[PDB]
Amino acid sequence: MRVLVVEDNALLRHHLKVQIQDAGHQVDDAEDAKEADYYLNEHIPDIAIVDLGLPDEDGLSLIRRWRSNDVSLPILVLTARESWQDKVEVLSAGADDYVTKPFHIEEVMARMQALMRRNSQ
Amino acid sequence: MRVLVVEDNALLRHHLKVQIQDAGHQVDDAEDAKEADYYLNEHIPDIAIVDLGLPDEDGLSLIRRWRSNDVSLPILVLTARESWQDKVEVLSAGADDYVTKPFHIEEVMARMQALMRRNSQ
Ligand code: BEF
Ligand code: BEF
Ligand SMILES: [Mg+2]
Ligand SMILES: [Mg+2]
Ligand SMILES: [Pt+2]
Ligand SMILES: [Pt+2]
Ligand SMILES: [Pt+2]
Ligand SMILES: [Pt+2]
Ligand SMILES: [Pt+2]
Ligand SMILES: [Pt+2]
C-alpha cells in the first residue's frame, strides 16, 4: 500500500502523511504538481490524495493530464474548493471522490479505505 | 447498466429513477429494504443507490447484510443523515460513497459515473 499526497500547505501535507503512515502505508508527499509527477514516475502509488489549489499547475489540470496518459489509480481530492459545480467537474475529469476542507480525518480515512477496499478486493 | 434505487420517499424515488433512466440505464425502484432484496434477487444491479431511513430495516443494516452475503456491487448512499460519524460508519460498513440530502442531481450523477467508470474500466 503506497500512497501519494499532493498538498502545498506544508503543515497539512506533513500531518496527512503521518496519519496515513500510522494507518500502515508507505507515503510520498509532494508540494506541487511537478513534484507529484516525480514521485509518480519514481513509484506509481496505489492511491493519491490530491489538493486542487497548487502553486503552478492546479490539481484539476494534473488529474486530467494523468488520466489522459493512462494513469488510472484511484484519486481522492481534498480541497478548500466547496462549490458543487467544481465537485462535478473534478469528478467528471477522473477524480474518484471529493472531500472539502475543513474535514474530519476519520472520514477521509474511511473514504480512502473504500477506494482501496474495492481497488484490491 | 442496471441500477437499483432504494428510497421510501415515493416522489423522490420516482424522480431518481427517471433521472437515471434518462441517463441511459434500466432501473428498478424499491420502497423498503425487503423490496430491495426482491429486485436484487431478480436481477443483480450493477450499482445501487441506498437511502438509510427505511420503514423497517434501515439502510445501514441492509448494506451490512448484503456485504456479509458476498454482494459486492458498488453502493452509493443518499440520505438525510448528515453527521460525519454516520458517514464513517456507513462507509466502513461497505458503502462506496455517501451523499447528503438536500443534494444536486448533477453531483450524484457524477458520483455514480465515477463508481461505474472504475467498476467497468
Ligand atoms: F488548495 Be486546496 F484546493 F485546498
Ligand atoms: F431517510 Be433517508 F436516510 F434520507
Ligand atoms: Mg493548496
Ligand atoms: Mg427514507
Ligand atoms: Pt493537521
Ligand atoms: Pt487515509
Ligand atoms: Pt490503506
Ligand atoms: Pt425530486
Ligand atoms: Pt446517476
Ligand atoms: Pt451509468
Swiss-Prot record, chains A, B:
Main location (coarse class): cytoplasm
Key word Cell membrane present: no
Protein name per its UniProtKB record: Transcriptional regulatory protein PhoP
Tree of life domain: Bacteria
UniProt-recorded Gene Ontology molecular function terms: DNA-binding transcription activator activity; identical protein binding; phosphorelay response regulator activity; transcription cis-regulatory region binding
Subcellular location: Cytoplasm
Modification 4-aspartylphosphate occurs at: 51
Activity regulation details: Feedback inhibited by MgrB, which seems to bind PhoQ, altering its activity and that of downstream effector PhoP. PhoP-regulated transcription is redox-sensitive, being activated when the periplasm becomes more reducing (deletion of dsbA/dsbB, or treatment with dithiothreitol). MgrB acts between DsbA/DsbB and PhoP/PhoQ in this pathway.
Subunit (UniProt): Monomer in the inactive, unphosphorylated state and dimer in the active, phosphorylated state.
Disruption outcome: Altered expression of 33 genes; 9 are down-regulated, the rest up-regulated.
One annotated GO biological process: regulation of DNA-templated transcription
GO cellular component: cytosol; protein-DNA complex
Signal peptide extent: none
Record key words, sorted: Activator, Cytoplasm, DNA-binding, Phosphoprotein, Repressor, Transcription, Transcription regulation, Two-component regulatory system
UniProt domain Response regulatory: residue ranges: 2-116
Additional information: There is a close linkage between the Rcs and PhoQ/P signaling systems, and both signaling systems respond to certain external divalent cations (zinc and magnesium).
Protein modification: Phosphorylated by PhoQ.
UniProt induction comment: The phoP/phoQ operon is positively autoregulated by both PhoP and PhoQ in a Mg(2+)-dependent manner, inhibited at high Mg(2+) concentrations. Induced by dsbA disruption and dithiothreitol.
Organism in which the protein naturally occurs: Escherichia coli (strain K12)
Function: Member of the two-component regulatory system PhoP/PhoQ involved in adaptation to low Mg(2+) environments and the control of acid resistance genes. In low periplasmic Mg(2+), PhoQ phosphorylates PhoP, resulting in the expression of PhoP-activated genes (PAG) and repression of PhoP-repressed genes (PRG). In high periplasmic Mg(2+), PhoQ dephosphorylates phospho-PhoP, resulting in the repression of PAG and may lead to expression of some PRG. Mediates magnesium influx to the cytosol by activation of MgtA.
